[PDB]
C-alpha cells in the first residue's frame, strides 16, 4: 500500500 | 565573483506544502522514477530534461492506493529547484 513521508 | 547560492540544484520529490508518497514495497514514487530516467537517459539528455521526465512519470503513472479513504487516489508532482548556471550532462 502507499504511505506518506 | 559568483553568488554563494549559485550552482545548487534541489530536486524535491514533491511540491511545497505537500505530502510525498512512498510505496511500502517498491519505494518512493520519486526515487523509483528518478532512477529509471537516469538509467534510460543520463547518456543522452541534459539533467533538467531528465528531471522533467521524472515529473511526468510521477504525475501520470502513480496514484495512491490506501485503505484510508482520506489518503486514497491521491497524486504527486515533484519540484525542481535550480540555481544552476550551466547545463549538466553526466558524460
Amino acid at each position: 500500500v502507499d504511505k506518506v513521508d | 565573483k559568483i553568488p554563494v547560492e549559485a550552482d545548487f540544484l534541489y530536486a524535491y520529490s514533491t511540491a511545497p506544502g505537500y505530502y510525498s508518497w512512498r510505496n511500502s514495497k517498491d519505494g518512493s514514487w520519486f526515487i523509483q522514477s528518478l532512477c529509471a530516467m537516469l538509467k534510460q537517459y543520463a547518456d543522452k539528455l541534459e539533467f533538467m530534461h531528465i528531471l522533467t521526465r521524472v515529473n511526468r512519470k510521477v504525475a501520470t503513472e502513480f496514484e495512491s492506493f490506501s485503505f484510508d479513504a482520506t489518503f486514497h487516489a491521491k497524486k504527486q508532482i515533484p519540484c525542481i529547484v535550480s540555481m544552476l548556471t550551466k547545463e549538466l550532462y553526466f558524460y
Binding site: 504511505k3 506518506v4 513521508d5 | 559568483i2 553568488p3 554563494v4 547560492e5 549559485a6 550552482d7 545548487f8 540544484l9 534541489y10 530536486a11 524535491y12 520529490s13 514533491t14 511540491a15 511545497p16 506544502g17 505537500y18 505530502y19 510525498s20 512512498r22 510505496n23 511500502s24 514495497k25 517498491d26 519505494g27 518512493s28 520519486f30 526515487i31 523509483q32 528518478l34 532512477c35 537516469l38 538509467k39 543520463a42 496514484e63 482520506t70 489518503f71 487516489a73 491521491k74 497524486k75 504527486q76 508532482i77 544552476l84 550551466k86 547545463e87 549538466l88 550532462y89 553526466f90 558524460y91
Partner: protein
C-alpha cells in the same frame, strides 16, 4: 561555459542518507520501502561513476556532523557533488531519527564561500521527504 566541466578525474561523491527507523519518542512511522530506494540509488549512481556512500538511520546530530565532514573534504578533483536525503520531513525540514534538521543548515556547508573546492561545480540535493500535509486530489 554553457555546460559544467564533467571531465575531472572523478565525478564526485554521492552521499545517501537513508532514514528508515525513527525513535518512538518522535512518533514517526517506519519508512517501509526506503531500502529499495537506497539500493536503487546506489546502483544508479555507481553506473554514473559516483563514489557512493550509504549511511543508515542517522540522528540529526550525525547528519549535521557528516555533512560538515564531507564539505571539508578536498573535492578539487571531483566534478560535482550529490546528496540524497530519504526521510520524513516538513517544509524546509528533514528528520533525523530523533528530530528535525533545517535543510538550509545542511546545504549551507557546501555554499560557494564555505566549500571552496566545490565553488563553480554543481551541487545536487535530491530530497525524498514530505514538505507538509497537503494532499493533491488530482484532476481528470
Amino acid at each position: 561555459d554553457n555546460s559544467y566541466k564533467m571531465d575531472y578525474p572523478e565525478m564526485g561523491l554521492c552521499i545517501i542518507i537513508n532514514n528508515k527507523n525513527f525513535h518512538k519518542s518522535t512518533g514517526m512511522t517506519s519508512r517501509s520501502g526506503t531500502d529499495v530506494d537506497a539500493a536503487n540509488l546506489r546502483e544508479t549512481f555507481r553506473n554514473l561513476k559516483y563514489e557512493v556512500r550509504n549511511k543508515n538511520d542517522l540522528t540529526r546530530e550525525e547528519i549535521v556532523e557528516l555533512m560538515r565532514d564531507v564539505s571539508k573534504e578536498d573535492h578539487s578533483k571531483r566534478s560535482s557533488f550529490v546528496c540524497v536525503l530519504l526521510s520524513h520531513g516538513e517544509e524546509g525540514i528533514i528528520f533525523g531519527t530523533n528530530g528535525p534538521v533545517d535543510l538550509k543548515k545542511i546545504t549551507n556547508f557546501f555554499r560557494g564561500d564555505r566549500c571552496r573546492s566545490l565553488t563553480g561545480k554543481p551541487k545536487l540535493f535530491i530530497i525524498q521527504a514530505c514538505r507538509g500535509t497537503e494532499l493533491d486530489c488530482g484532476i481528470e
